[PDB]
Amino acid sequence: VKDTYTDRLDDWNGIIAGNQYYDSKNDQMAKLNQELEGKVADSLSSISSQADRIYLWEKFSNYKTSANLTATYRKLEEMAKQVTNPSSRYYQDETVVRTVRDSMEWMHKHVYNSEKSIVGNWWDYEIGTPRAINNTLSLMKEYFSDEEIKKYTDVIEKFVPDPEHFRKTTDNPVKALGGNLVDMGRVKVIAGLLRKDDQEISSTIRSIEQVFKLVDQGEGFYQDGSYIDHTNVAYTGAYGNVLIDGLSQLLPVIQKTKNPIDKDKMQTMYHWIDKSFAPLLVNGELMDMSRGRSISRANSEGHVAAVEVLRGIHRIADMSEGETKQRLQSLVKTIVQSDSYYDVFKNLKTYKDISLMQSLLSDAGVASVPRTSYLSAFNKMDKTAMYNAEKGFGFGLSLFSSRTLNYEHMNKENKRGWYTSDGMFYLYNGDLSHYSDGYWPTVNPYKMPGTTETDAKRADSDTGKVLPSAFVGTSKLDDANATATMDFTNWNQTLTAHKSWFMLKDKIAFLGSNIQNTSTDTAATTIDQRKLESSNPYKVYVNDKEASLTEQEKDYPETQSVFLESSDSKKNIGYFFFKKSSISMSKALQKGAWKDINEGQSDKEVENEFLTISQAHKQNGDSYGYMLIPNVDRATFNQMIKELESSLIENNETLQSVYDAKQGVWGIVKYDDSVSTISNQFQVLKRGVYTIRKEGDEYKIAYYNPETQESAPDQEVFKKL
Numbered sequence: 001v002k003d004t005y006t007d008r009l010d011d012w013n014g015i016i017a018g019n020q021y022y023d024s025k026n027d028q029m030a031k032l033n034q035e036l037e038g039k040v041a042d043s044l045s046s047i048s049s050q051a052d053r054i055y056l057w058e059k060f061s062n063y064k065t066s067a068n069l070t071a072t073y074r075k076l077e078e079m080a081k082q083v084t085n086p087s088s089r090y091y092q093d094e095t096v097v098r099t100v101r102d103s104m105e106w107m108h109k110h111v112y113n114s115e116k117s118i119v120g121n122w123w124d125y126e127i128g129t130p131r132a133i134n135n136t137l138s139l140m141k142e143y144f145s146d147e148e149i150k151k152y153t154d155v156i157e158k159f160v161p162d163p164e165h166f167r168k169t170t171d172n173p174v175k176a177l178g179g180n181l182v183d184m185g186r187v188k189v190i191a192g193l194l195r196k197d198d199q200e201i202s203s204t205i206r207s208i209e210q211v212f213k214l215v216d217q218g219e220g221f222y223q224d225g226s227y228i229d230h231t232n233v234a235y236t237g238a239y240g241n242v243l244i245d246g247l248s249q250l251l252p253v254i255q256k257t258k259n260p261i262d263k264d265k266m267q268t269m270y271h272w273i274d275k276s277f278a279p280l281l282v283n284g285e286l287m288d289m290s291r292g293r294s295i296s297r298a299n300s301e302g303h304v305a306a307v308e309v310l311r312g313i314h315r316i317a318d319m320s321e322g323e324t325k326q327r328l329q330s331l332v333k334t335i336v337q338s339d340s341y342y343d344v345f346k347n348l349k350t351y352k353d354i355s356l357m358q359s360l361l362s363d364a365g366v367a368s369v370p371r372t373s374y375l376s377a378f379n380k381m382d383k384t385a386m387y388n389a390e391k392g393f394g395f396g397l398s399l400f401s402s403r404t405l406n407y408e409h410m411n412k413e414n415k416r417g418w419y420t421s422d423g424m425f426y427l428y429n430g431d432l433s434h435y436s437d438g439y440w441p442t443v444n445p446y447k448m449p450g451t452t453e454t455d456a457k458r459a460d461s462d463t464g465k466v467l468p469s470a471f472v473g474t475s476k477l478d479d480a481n482a483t484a485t486m487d488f489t490n491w492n493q494t495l496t497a498h499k500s501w502f503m504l505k506d507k508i509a510f511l512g513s514n515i516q517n518t519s520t521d522t523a524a525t526t527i528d529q530r531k532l533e534s535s536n537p538y539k540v541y542v543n544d545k546e547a548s549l550t551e552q553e554k555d556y557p558e559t560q561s562v563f564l565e566s567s568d569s570k571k572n573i574g575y576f577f578f579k580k581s582s583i584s585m586s587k588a589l590q591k592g593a594w595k596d597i598n599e600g601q602s603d604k605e606v607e608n609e610f611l612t613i614s615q616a617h618k619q620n621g622d623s624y625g626y627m628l629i630p631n632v633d634r635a636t637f638n639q640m641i642k643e644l645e646s647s648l649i650e651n652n653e654t655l656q657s658v659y660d661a662k663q664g665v666w667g668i669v670k671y672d673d674s675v676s677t678i679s680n681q682f683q684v685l686k687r688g689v690y691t692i693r694k695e696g697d698e699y700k701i702a703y704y705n706p707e708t709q710e711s712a713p714d715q716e717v718f719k720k721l
């Protein structure tokens with residue numbers, strides 16, 4: 001029956017596939033159509049026939065493995081897309097129409113119905129498979145009866161009766177929040193439209209409105225831009241992706257139902273984009289520290305993942321107007337145009353998304369200006385993101401605390417993420433491919449960059465932990481200096497370090513003190529583990545003299561500096577040791593498979609060359625301290641390190657501070673409430689984290705207490721001398 005429900009389903013079809021917008025002369029659209037043609041051809045040649053059948057596809061045949069339900073139904077959705085595309089060779093094809101109908105009936109009677117219970121992953125039973133069924137029925141609604149559509153969605157209502165909860169049919173339900181709550185909309189608003197059910201539509205939209213509230217605790221978006229999911233995991237770049245991607249699809253539909261969402265109540269979306277998402281996007285890449293276990297998926301490296309967010313923004317721009325629309329278009333345009341490594345179209349998977357992106361890129365009225373410098377202190381999820389527009393590098397420094405889980409290993413994914421929040425850092429430079437092309441399966445997981453660890457073996461079966469201490473966080477001065485500590489203890493309480501970072505505009509100081517080890521394992525800090533490009537070799541200098549690195553580790557006692565020199569200055573990396581330090585270095589081919597870190601991935605061997613730099617800590621009370629200086633040439637690095645000769649103010653058990661004389665900026669971390677006198681100019685008075693600027697005779701003060709998550713009045717923490 002044609003009516004206002006089917007009008008909404010037509011709009012949905014325009015969003016999830018966009019056959020109406022297909023243009024055979026549009027090269028990017030034709031490429032996606034060809035991908036879909038081949039998928040459908042492969043499915044048809046492969047499907048089990050005879051007996052009518054007995055499983056549908058051998059590759060997805062064990063129905064106790066719940067991913068096989070979703071993968072099966074997704075094959076049918078692909079058929080529905082092509083059967084309704086006038087330019088497809090399968091357009092209105094009699095075999096395809098009957099194959100979708102027969103396959104729906106077979107799965108209904110044998111695999112997935114209201115008489116079943118969840119076996120394996122609840123997510124397949126409540127989100128993945130329901131989404132695929134809904135979209136199939138929506139696209140092919142002119143080939144199914146209303147009665148058949150009810151029959152094939154009754155199972156969705158068995159598993160997902162309540163728009164406020166997931167896992168309702170299990171003995172242990174969960175409150176629907178975050179990205180999964182948006183998926184609740186793609187399940188229940190669409191099933192409600194298919195089933196002509198006003199109460200389902202209205203109740204589900206009411207439930208989704210929760211997503212617009214900023215939270216003080218628990219899962220969701222915070223005022224400082226943090227996003228938490230799975231109780232206490234930093235997750236903007238995976239679950240937050242689902243939230244923006246899914247909601248941007250649903251909104252044009254919801255807003256034409258009887259129950260539209262209020263404008264002022266949707267205003268929060270622009271907060272997410274500017275505060276939460278934008279800072280985590282560097283040269284088209286979505287920072288891995290925000291993506292949880294998704295880093296272990298070969299098809300979801302950081303520039304691919306970023307497109308989920310970008311397409312969400314561009315859809316939101318399209319539903320906006322005027323200046324808010326142009327500025328959101330301009331944000332997408334400049335991000336895409338900055339990405340010389342990844343082709344955005346490779347992850348635009350509907351014709352309307354392709355069309356919107358093409359419009360944006362060709363419209364000379366939409367500005368594309370390089371983004372300015374920023375520094376986001378995501379204290380509520382223990383991550384920090386920094387970007388310097390003048391020199392063109394990004395830096396990610398994010399951590400964990402008593403408030404947050406270190407890493408997520410779940411559903412057999414991210415088996416070796418053990419040390420990815422132990423003060424791990426990321427550098428985003430002119431090598432846009434660095435964390436891609438198989439970085440995650442080939443990186444040595446025992447030597448994550450920046451981390452101080454012992455060499456004890458770790459079990460793939462381990463799961464994440466919280467940190468004993470709450471003394472973890474960042475004090476930001478400006479919008480562009482800002483800055484951090486972590487009262488670090490390792491996974492088995494055998495090693496400690498006071499680890500601090502001093503973000504000073506064009507460089508970052510790394511200080512570690514109080515390094516202690518009660519184990520018989522050896523301790524060290526990985527200064528770097530950098531993935532190399534064979535096309536762009538580094539010439540390596542130690543103390544400004546060329547060094548030849550080998551697979552075998554070589555020791556360099558009395559090192560003041562290390563310089564990695566590229567033909568491209570925007571790939572150069574320097575390390576300045578404030579005090580001469582004993583380090584070791586190697587350049588080695590590292591091999592691995594994605595299956596090693598994610599049981600569901602390919603076992604094919606991958607390899608990459610890495611340059612590792614380490615500093616051993618053989619004694620209690622050991623220390624490290626060095627300045628990371630990117631994106632300058634060798635002569636300029638050599639001048640800078642002379643400017644910085646006395647930049648290290650203190651690096652002990654109670655006080656760590658670095659001074660940038662050129663800027664007039666100090667970073668300070670105090671672990672106690674002693675009076676600390678700094679540079680014979682002022683005193684700082686309380687345990688916590690400081691970034692201070694002298695401007696003539698005045699001081700600008702940024703203080704943060706990471707444990708109480710509070711600043712303080714200037715007079716409580718600072719005194720000019």
